[PDB]
Amino acid sequence: MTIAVTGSIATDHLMRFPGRFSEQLLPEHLHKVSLSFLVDDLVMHRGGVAGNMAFAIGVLGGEVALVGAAGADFADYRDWLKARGVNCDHVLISETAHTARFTCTTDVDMAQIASFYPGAMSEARNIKLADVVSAIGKPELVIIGANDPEAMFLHTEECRKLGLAFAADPSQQLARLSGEEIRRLVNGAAYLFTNDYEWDLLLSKTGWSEADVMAQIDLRVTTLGPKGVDLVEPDGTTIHVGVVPETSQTDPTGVGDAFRAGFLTGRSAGLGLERSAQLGSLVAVLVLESTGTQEWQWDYEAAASRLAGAYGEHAAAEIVAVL
Amino acid sequence: MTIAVTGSIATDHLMRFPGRFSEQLLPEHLHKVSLSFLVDDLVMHRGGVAGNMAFAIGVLGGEVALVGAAGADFADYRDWLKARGVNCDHVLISETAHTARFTCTTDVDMAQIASFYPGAMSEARNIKLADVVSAIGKPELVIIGANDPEAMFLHTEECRKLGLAFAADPSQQLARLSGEEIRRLVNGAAYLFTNDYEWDLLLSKTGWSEADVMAQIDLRVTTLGPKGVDLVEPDGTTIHVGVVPETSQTDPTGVGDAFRAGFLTGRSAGLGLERSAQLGSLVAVLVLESTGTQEWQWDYEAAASRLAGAYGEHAAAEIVAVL
Ligand SMILES: Nc1ncnc2c1ncn2[C@@H]1O[C@H](COP(=O)(O)OP(=O)(O)CP(=O)(O)O)[C@@H](O)[C@H]1O
Numbered sequence: 001m002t003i004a005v006t007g008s009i010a011t012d013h014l015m016r017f018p019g020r021f022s023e024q025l026l027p028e029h030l031h032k033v034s035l036s037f038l039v040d041d042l043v044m045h046r047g048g049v050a051g052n053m054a055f056a057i058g059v060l061g062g063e064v065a066l067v068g069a070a071g072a073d074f075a076d077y078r079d080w081l082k083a084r085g086v087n088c089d090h091v092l093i094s095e096t097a098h099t100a101r102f103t104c105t106t107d108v109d110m111a112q113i114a115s116f117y118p119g120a121m122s123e124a125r126n127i128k129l130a131d132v133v134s135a136i137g138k139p140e141l142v143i144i145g146a147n148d149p150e151a152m153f154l155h156t157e158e159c160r161k162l163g164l165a166f167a168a169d170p171s172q173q174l175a176r177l178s179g180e181e182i183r184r185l186v187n188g189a190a191y192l193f194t195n196d197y198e199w200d201l202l203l204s205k206t207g208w209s210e211a212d213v214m215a216q217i218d219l220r221v222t223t224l225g226p227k228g229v230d231l232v233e234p235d236g237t238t239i240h241v242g243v244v245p246e247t248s249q250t251d252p253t254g255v256g257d258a259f260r261a262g263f264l265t266g267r268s269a270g271l272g273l274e275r276s277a278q279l280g281s282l283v284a285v286l287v288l289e290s291t292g293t294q295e296w297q298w299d300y301e302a303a304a305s306r307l308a309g310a311y312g313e314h315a316a317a318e319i320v321a322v323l
Numbered sequence: 324m325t326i327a328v329t330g331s332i333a334t335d336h337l338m339r340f341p342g343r344f345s346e347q348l349l350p351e352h353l354h355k356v357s358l359s360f361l362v363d364d365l366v367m368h369r370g371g372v373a374g375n376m377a378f379a380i381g382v383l384g385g386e387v388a389l390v391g392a393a394g395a396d397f398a399d400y401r402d403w404l405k406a407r408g409v410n411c412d413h414v415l416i417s418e419t420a421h422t423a424r425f426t427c428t429t430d431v432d433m434a435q436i437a438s439f440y441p442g443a444m445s446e447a448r449n450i451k452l453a454d455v456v457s458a459i460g461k462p463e464l465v466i467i468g469a470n471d472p473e474a475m476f477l478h479t480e481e482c483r484k485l486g487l488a489f490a491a492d493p494s495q496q497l498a499r500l501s502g503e504e505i506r507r508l509v510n511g512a513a514y515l516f517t518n519d520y521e522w523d524l525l526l527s528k529t530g531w532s533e534a535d536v537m538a539q540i541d542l543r544v545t546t547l548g549p550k551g552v553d554l555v556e557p558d559g560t561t562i563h564v565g566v567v568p569e570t571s572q573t574d575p576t577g578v579g580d581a582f583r584a585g586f587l588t589g590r591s592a593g594l595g596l597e598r599s600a601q602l603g604s605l606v607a608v609l610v611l612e613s614t615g616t617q618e619w620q621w622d623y624e625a626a627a628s629r630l631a632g633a634y635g636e637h638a639a640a641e642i643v644a645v646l
């Protein structure tokens with residue numbers, strides 16, 4: 001039942017500036033700035049797509065190994081994940097680079113100044129999935145989450161070499177890759193995850209028809225925001241599941257990651273496609289209603305009640321029975 | 324022999340941008356920016372004036388208590404200091420704020436974009452030195468390092484209330500305080516530390532003559548950069564000690580902090596004024612030759628050799644004998 005999650009591991013360091021960046025920028029010597037912002041607030045969120053997905057799977061009680069690259073400063077993040085049941089044995093720790101970091105300061109008019117530090121992320125290309133297979137045996141599924149582009153290809157190729165079922169998450173990189181590069185991420189996939197816009201892009205760029213893709217993959221999962229999700233089998237059967245109604249639209253960061261994690265946890269727990277997408281939808285709404293990506297809580301009774309409200313008591317009982 | 328160090332506790336998070344900020348700034352919508360810098364490097368240095376001074380005293384084998392405000396994220400920094408002999412029992416840990424942070428990105432033309440997050444620093448005004456006195460007895464000296472302005476005043480007043488000898492470090496705040504406010508930081512001091520420019524400023528702003536100050540304090544210590552240091556007693560005796568010659572001018576950050584720490588360690592170890600300033604000068608040059616402020620090493624044999632080279636074998640033997 002073990003899901004190996006590959007992809008980025010990062011933290012986000014977010015600061016609030018009470019004033020207006022413009023008031024410092026407008027008079028500036030733009031050819032050699034010396035800007036100093038006195039900030040009000042500092043919030044740190046654990047993130048990266050692989051971290052977010054591993055977190056959610058762990059919290060739901062699934063079997064999960066996080067497989068990605070970080071720095072020695074990953075230690076607290078490791079502790080946080082291990083407490084939620086996440087196997088971190090196969091996180092590569094860089095000798096030289098820190099864990100990837102996104103730092104952003106936002107002003108009162110929502111202007112933003114950000115830095116992205118990739119750090120240890122490009123070292124994911126040095127991970128061997130054969131090492132995971134030696135230690136814990138063949139994972140039930142390997143998620144190919146957004147990552148260092150080369151690492152995404154190497155992990156996908158290795159899944160083929162080792163006979164591991166993999167999930168193609170081509171999203172973030174579709175706009176940046178050639179059609180031929182995209183094809184190589186998709187061929188032989190157990191699952192393909194994209195949103196609706198990305199799905200149309202994937203087809204256009206690859207020169208593939210839908211029929212072409214469905215002969216390459218076992219299930220297309222296409223998310224539709226508030227319109228729910230489509231699950232399409234190679235036989236032409238389609239299942240559409242609507243969302244769990246939100247009470248807050250607070251923070252849409254990490255909502256796609258959480259859907260995937262909940263859906264795949266469902267699958268590993270033996271749930272069918274519809275029940276799995278219903279669970280995915282619940283995890284997604286809980287992330288939507290939380291600031292950050294791993295700041296949400298799992299309340300068994302509340303989950304049961306919310307699933308019942310969205311999908312009926314029968315669906316809810318069947319879903320909760322697998323935790 | 325216990326020195327209680329009050330003042331700021333912080334970390335510095337420094338990033339390098341390979342390109343030019345101008346190339347992103349010049350075309351920008353300055354009224355609502357959305358800047359994203361892909362950075363090359365991330366270096367974190369432990370800092371704050373109290374942290375730097377406590378570190379140096381600890382490393383030299385002196386008895387030291389760090390007395391300042393930080394956040395729960397101070398834990399690793401605490402571990403780092405405790406390993407160097409620093410008592411951290413009386414660091415106030417905020418319930419709500421993180422440890423103060425300076426974050427700075429520098430481009431290829433040395434343009435800079437920085438944020439300062441004060442965080443837990445204003446909570447230093449809630450520290451009671453009477454709590455230190457209960458736990459470890461009366462410190463031999465309390466350093467009033469640059470801090471939250473109100474905390475500097477409250478700590479100085481409490482030193483008077485409790486009968487504790489204190490060191491006035493009025494530097495960073497001289498330009499910002501009234502003459503009357505400056506007087507209140509100076510009255511009754513065991514030591515006054517400033518540089519030469521700051522000394523002239525202090526006099527002008529307070530309306531005090533030198534004679535006026537020397538009737539308030541037990542020793543004026545005035546640092547002169549590469550020209551060394553003056554030590555002036557209330558009797559009119561002056562001792563000038565020249566610097567230990569540098570082999571690198573790498574990073575002048577923290578050099579004033581290190582001089583103070585080395586000098587005061589000397590004093591607590593029973594060394595006279597000249598020998599103490601000779602030790603201070605060595606610690607200062609070691610910081611000058613290191614990037615950051617607590618990244619330097621203490622090598623007993625190397626110290627002895629360098630002190631001998633600057634000040635003679637007799638001076639060196641007397642200095643090293645107290646570690
Ligand atoms: N307003 C809303 N209320 C409840 N659930 C929602 C929602 N919007 C999205 N979701 C859930 O999250 C899933 C994925 O969201 P979406 O289709 O926006 O993917 P995405 O990849 O565009 C998000 P990201 O910006 O994180 O990449 C949806 O299928 C749905 O289950």
Ligand SMILES: Nc1ncnc2c1ncn2[C@@H]1O[C@H](COP(=O)(O)OP(=O)(O)CP(=O)(O)O)[C@@H](O)[C@H]1O
Nearest residue numbers: 518546547548549551552566569578579582604607
């Ligand atoms: N070029 C140099 N070589 C060796 N030692 C030096 C030096 N410059 C300064 N020092 C040492 O450090 C001491 C304090 O330096 P300085 O007089 O620059 O204080 P300051 O308060 O201006 C530094 P800061 O910018 O950290 O506040 C000097 O008295 C000297 O012992």
